Amino acid sequence: MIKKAVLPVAGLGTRFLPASKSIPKEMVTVVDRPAIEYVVREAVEAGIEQIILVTHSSKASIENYFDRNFELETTLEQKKKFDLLAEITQIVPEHVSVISVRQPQPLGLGHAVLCAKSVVGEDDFAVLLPDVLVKDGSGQNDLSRMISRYNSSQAAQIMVEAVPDHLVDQYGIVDVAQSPNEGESIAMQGIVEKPPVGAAPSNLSVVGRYVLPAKIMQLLENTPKGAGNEIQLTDAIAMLQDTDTVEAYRMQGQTFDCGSKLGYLKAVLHYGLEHPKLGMEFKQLILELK
Amino acid sequence: MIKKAVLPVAGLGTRFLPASKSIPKEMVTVVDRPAIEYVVREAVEAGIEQIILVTHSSKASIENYFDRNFELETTLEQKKKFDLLAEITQIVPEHVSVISVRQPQPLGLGHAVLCAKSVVGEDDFAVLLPDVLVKDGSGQNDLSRMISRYNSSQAAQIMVEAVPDHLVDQYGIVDVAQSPNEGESIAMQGIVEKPPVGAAPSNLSVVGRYVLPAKIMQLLENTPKGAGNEIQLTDAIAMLQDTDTVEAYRMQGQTFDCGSKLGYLKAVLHYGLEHPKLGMEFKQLILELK
Amino acid sequence: MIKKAVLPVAGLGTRFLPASKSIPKEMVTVVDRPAIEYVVREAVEAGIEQIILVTHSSKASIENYFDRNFELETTLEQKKKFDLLAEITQIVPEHVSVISVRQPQPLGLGHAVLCAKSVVGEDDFAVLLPDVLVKDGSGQNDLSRMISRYNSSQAAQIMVEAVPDHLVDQYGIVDVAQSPNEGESIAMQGIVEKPPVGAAPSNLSVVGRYVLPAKIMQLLENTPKGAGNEIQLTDAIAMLQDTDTVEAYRMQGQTFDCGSKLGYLKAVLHYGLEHPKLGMEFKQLILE
Amino acid sequence: MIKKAVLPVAGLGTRFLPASKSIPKEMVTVVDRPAIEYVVREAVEAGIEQIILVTHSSKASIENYFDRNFELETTLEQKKKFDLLAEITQIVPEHVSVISVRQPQPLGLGHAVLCAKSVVGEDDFAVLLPDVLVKDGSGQNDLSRMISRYNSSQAAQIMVEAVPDHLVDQYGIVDVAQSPNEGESIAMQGIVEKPPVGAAPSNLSVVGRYVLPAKIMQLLENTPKGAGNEIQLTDAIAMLQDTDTVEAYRMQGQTFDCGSKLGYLKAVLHYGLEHPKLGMEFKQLILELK
Numbered sequence A, B, D: 001m002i003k004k005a006v007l008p009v010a011g012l013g014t015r016f017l018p019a020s021k022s023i024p025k026e027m028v029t030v031v032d033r034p035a036i037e038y039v040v041r042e043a044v045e046a047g048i049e050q051i052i053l054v055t056h057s058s059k060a061s062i063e064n065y066f067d068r069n070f071e072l073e074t075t076l077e078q079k080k081k082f083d084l085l086a087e088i089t090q091i092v093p094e095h096v097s098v099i100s101v102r103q104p105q106p107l108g109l110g111h112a113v114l115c116a117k118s119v120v121g122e123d124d125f126a127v128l129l130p131d132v133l134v135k136d137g138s139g140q141n142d143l144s145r146m147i148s149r150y151n152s153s154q155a156a157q158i159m160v161e162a163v164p165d166h167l168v169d170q171y172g173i174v175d176v177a178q179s180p181n182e183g184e185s186i187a188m189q190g191i192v193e194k195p196p197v198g199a200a201p202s203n204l205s206v207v208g209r210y211v212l213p214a215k216i217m218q219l220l221e222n223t224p225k226g227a228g229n230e231i232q233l234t235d236a237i238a239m240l241q242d243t244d245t246v247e248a249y250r251m252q253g254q255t256f257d258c259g260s261k262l263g264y265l266k267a268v269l270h271y272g273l274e275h276p277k278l279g280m281e282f283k284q285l286i287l288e289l290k
Numbered sequence C: 001m002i003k004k005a006v007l008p009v010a011g012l013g014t015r016f017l018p019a020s021k022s023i024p025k026e027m028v029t030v031v032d033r034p035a036i037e038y039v040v041r042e043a044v045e046a047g048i049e050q051i052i053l054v055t056h057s058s059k060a061s062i063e064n065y066f067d068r069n070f071e072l073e074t075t076l077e078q079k080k081k082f083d084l085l086a087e088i089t090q091i092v093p094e095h096v097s098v099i100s101v102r103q104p105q106p107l108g109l110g111h112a113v114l115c116a117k118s119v120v121g122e123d124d125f126a127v128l129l130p131d132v133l134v135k136d137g138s139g140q141n142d143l144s145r146m147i148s149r150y151n152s153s154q155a156a157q158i159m160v161e162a163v164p165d166h167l168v169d170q171y172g173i174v175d176v177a178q179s180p181n182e183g184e185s186i187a188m189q190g191i192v193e194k195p196p197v198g199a200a201p202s203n204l205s206v207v208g209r210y211v212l213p214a215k216i217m218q219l220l221e222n223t224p225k226g227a228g229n230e231i232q233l234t235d236a237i238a239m240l241q242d243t244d245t246v247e248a249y250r251m252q253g254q255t256f257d258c259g260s261k262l263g264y265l266k267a268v269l270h271y272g273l274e275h276p277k278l279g280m281e282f283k284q285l286i287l288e
């Protein structure tokens, strides 16, 4: 029932700038594979069949990653390395497509999502910020939970993890009665994007995983351009709360912010240890560093 | 209402090959604009809102043509040339989106169209072979008629032009009782892809302008492994006459084939003479030759 | 011996839009091939062997067009379409190097040529403005005549041809004693960039072909902004006339500006009919 | 003086995949910046001024990286964010040329260097293999010590360092007389490429740093296919040992091979800990692991 996911990938480097000058930020190397792939595989493992990149004129390498590469496939045959020729050809199942739409100017997430309007058309869709990875564990992943919850509830889902009270100006924050338990979704009565430390309806941060009705697209057309002169998505959610019901899902798994260079280095260490091939030999390389 | 049009643009440019080596065949510059624009501007003027490009890894320029180019815009401002600036920022109306999707391998026109099965969904959609221009006259354009005619008839429409009985080798050809009149569509009881010049149910060529129900995507999914090297669209329309009705609309327009190097030149001369600004200088420029 | 040409291909194509919006102006298809080709088939046919490109971020399409396109070669090799494989595989003969250096910002045709400084070193060199095609004359190509004339006179060559006195507005103009003859060179007293219509020393415009000494790089190092706050090559050709004799070669051939929207359409018409395989049938299309 | 360095980057990254599937192995991000930087910033800091790149159609992003980025630049002078501008603008000193010549087919690391003949001309040149990083904490960089030793001795330098007696069949190993000392040369009798684990002159591997006379280009033009159907450099380095004294400079620094998956991980740890802005907090994150 929820099949389409929007990834906004149209932002320039800035946050990440020397690395992401001449290649996209989304494409920077986490252990051995670009960040974007952790995001796509997350969607995929939740029954997402249509990936809708909202991309910029300079992000061809994201499109090409999920596409076949004649010169590289034939070099991987002429060297008889049918090993990788499988990993570089099945990056994504055959039933899963990948769709490119352009943001004309970087007028912010809200505008970005609104560019995937014509593709999403009439269906209820997920949104995954590809700045954020979401390492899970036993059984399903967090996004799989939210969709099935969206299905039975028919109420927009919005992932939330609790953060230090001072990093609250950095994230969007949800107004909630009591915070819900890991893996469950308590109704929410308000949301705000740039809340100054102490002026926070709670400590529960918007993680960057959503599930939203195609209404949100007509709402995005008619949101004011506030929160830093940019059209904000979390404003369009507030306008949905005026009529439709919106819940805050608490995730079970830990996140990572590959926006911040520091947050990226954290994702390398943690994914570099959970790595099923070098995870252990990596651990050994850390110990012997001092 | 038929809104989505599919432009298969995934083919390398083998026919056009010194020119299209290092830029798409579709970006080949007719008078002063790329061929692809003439095609898109034909779709747009028939209430197409969604341009679905089935593209290759190389055909970046095509996507970028319908997007905004900061570097160029800002030099058109820094130079006072507000002339061009509106021409290159409004290549299409803003209600018109341009979606993009990848043909993993070149397995034929049919497999290209099938590649947009997800972007098309359940909506009846047009197909426009972008290596073929369709200069019209007064009132509205040809594709306009076909779509109005599809909507009322609910039966697939397939543009047909009369061609000499020896060039039947080089086209798809339709089977009709009586040949229809310019601007009207008689029913058709058969289609052939590459029938050998003399064994053809008529002299009516498939022009490469279609309107097709979403249904045809599941047929494409189960077409014989090709009529030639690869999977053919015309084959998938044979399997449509097995259940639904298919009509042949006879165009009232004159066409050009920018696939053949000689067809390209023909079009340069024709669009070059009908040019609002250069048109008559061009005439005077041709007249001056030995 | 003159070996290294220096094509400045770093300018966006504001003059030819929307054609050159997504592609470079140089890859504007003329009959059945990019423009740059014709200009590089000029350099080579006059014994140039190191085509230096001063390019931009946005102009990979040029560098790719003078290199092997793997997916295209292997598809054509398999299908045994040796005709079309011919047209892509040997564009410039195997001995011809094609070199890239980026013009970081576009501060003018001078700054442009001064970006090829390190790669030219101490070698005397030609400059071809790709925006402008020159059409092969009887046997010899105009550029060969110039190179061998610098190779004898050791004095810089500057290709020139007449223009209507009112269009002299928008070229470099050269001052002359006896007005040099068709295929002849003749000493000059000075050069000036985009001079005002009336009060310009002649009707002879700088075409876009030069042969210079590697001395010019140290003149261009000094030469200040002299047009749109833009470093000019002419303003360094001035500074050269100060010390060493400079000449003005006059065109034996015929020329097109693909800068102009009309100049393009003219080049497509001429090269059109003169085309080996297509000219014959093309000549028929016209008459209809 | 020695002023030109010849970086061969025409390889695809089959060794580091799917890292390099859509971005050059050279633009694989170490800590916060592409690998190639470190190599180029190592050449610069030994008075290299013309960084020649032998490159491939896929390697546009290298040439863009050592060039101005009009959108990024103006969109940083906008928010007056001079820190990040600092990072993209003078990545290498203003006095440094960066040249691009294309390697038509990948016929080997000799054929690669021979493609840069018409630009090295008659001048003696360094060659930096970009896959191999060299961290030089001494104060002077291993390449300055080498360039001044060729200057003084006029003898073709070759960086070498010790590798376990197994895994000698990866590198090209040298034939050392008196076994040279840390950061100083010793004349070598011969050199062989990827020799069998057993038939090994020494345990001293060719690292990837070389300083060579433009004699090589005339040798390289007349050496046949060595190991695989590849024109080795090591084989042309032998053909110079036949006539001129060739020395074997021993590493003082510490290397990494981003060719290998661990080499990368190890470089992202080391360069990571000795990072200015991140060292202190990265050191913090490694301690927070368990």
Ligand SMILES: O=c1ccn([C@@H]2O[C@H](COP(=O)(O)OP(=O)(O)O[C@H]3O[C@H](CO)[C@@H](O)[C@H](O)[C@H]3O)[C@@H](O)[C@H]2O)c(=O)[nH]1
Pocket (backbone or CB within 6 Å): A008, A009, A010, A011, A012, A054, A103, A105, A106, A107, A108, A109, A111, A112, A129, A130, A131, A132, A170, A171, A172, A173, A193, A205, A206, A207, A208, A233, A234, A259
């Ligand atoms: O015009 C734009 C602007 C942004 N982006 C993308 O948007 C994502 C993140 O948006 P950004 O503007 O960086 O905002 P954040 O600071 O990441 O804040 C967002 O993400 C937070 C979690 O990281 C949430 O808490 C907030 O609600 C949400 O606004 C990135 O992947 C960008 O590439 C676009 O594609 N186009």
Ligand SMILES: O=c1ccn([C@@H]2O[C@H](COP(=O)(O)OP(=O)(O)O[C@H]3O[C@H](CO)[C@@H](O)[C@H](O)[C@H]3O)[C@@H](O)[C@H]2O)c(=O)[nH]1
Pocket (backbone or CB within 6 Å): B008, B009, B010, B011, B012, B054, B103, B105, B106, B107, B108, B109, B111, B112, B129, B130, B131, B132, B170, B171, B172, B173, B193, B205, B206, B207, B208, B232, B233, B234, B259
């Ligand atoms: O795998 C492929 C093959 C082709 N194309 C593109 O799709 C079009 C197909 O044209 P082409 O491959 O040359 O086929 P044609 O020989 O033109 O045949 C088609 O076009 C005829 C009219 O031009 C019709 O009458 C036929 O029914 C139809 O099969 C071109 O624009 C190609 O670039 C793709 O995108 N993918």
Ligand SMILES: O=c1ccn([C@@H]2O[C@H](COP(=O)(O)OP(=O)(O)O[C@H]3O[C@H](CO)[C@@H](O)[C@H](O)[C@H]3O)[C@@H](O)[C@H]2O)c(=O)[nH]1
Pocket (backbone or CB within 6 Å): C008, C009, C010, C011, C012, C054, C103, C105, C106, C107, C108, C109, C111, C112, C129, C130, C131, C132, C170, C171, C172, C173, C193, C205, C206, C207, C208, C232, C233, C234
């Ligand atoms: O910073 C720059 C400026 C120009 N160019 C290129 O140089 C060529 C010519 O530059 P342009 O500014 O178009 O030249 P003009 O302003 O027309 O002036 C030159 O071109 C005329 C040819 O038409 C000559 O008559 C003039 O004397 C000569 O100075 C073009 O291909 C540009 O792309 C660059 O690469 N970088």
Ligand SMILES: O=c1ccn([C@@H]2O[C@H](COP(=O)(O)OP(=O)(O)O[C@H]3O[C@H](CO)[C@@H](O)[C@H](O)[C@H]3O)[C@@H](O)[C@H]2O)c(=O)[nH]1
Pocket (backbone or CB within 6 Å): D008, D009, D010, D011, D012, D054, D103, D105, D106, D107, D108, D109, D111, D112, D129, D130, D131, D132, D170, D171, D172, D173, D193, D205, D206, D207, D208, D232, D233, D234, D257
């Ligand atoms: O046709 C070619 C072949 C190689 N390369 C590049 O050359 C570099 C080094 O060559 P590569 O083939 O990756 O390594 P090997 O050739 O296996 O080994 C090289 O590197 C070893 C150290 O890693 C040395 O000991 C060897 O002498 C040297 O040949 C790589 O970045 C390649 O991209 C090219 O650009 N073009």
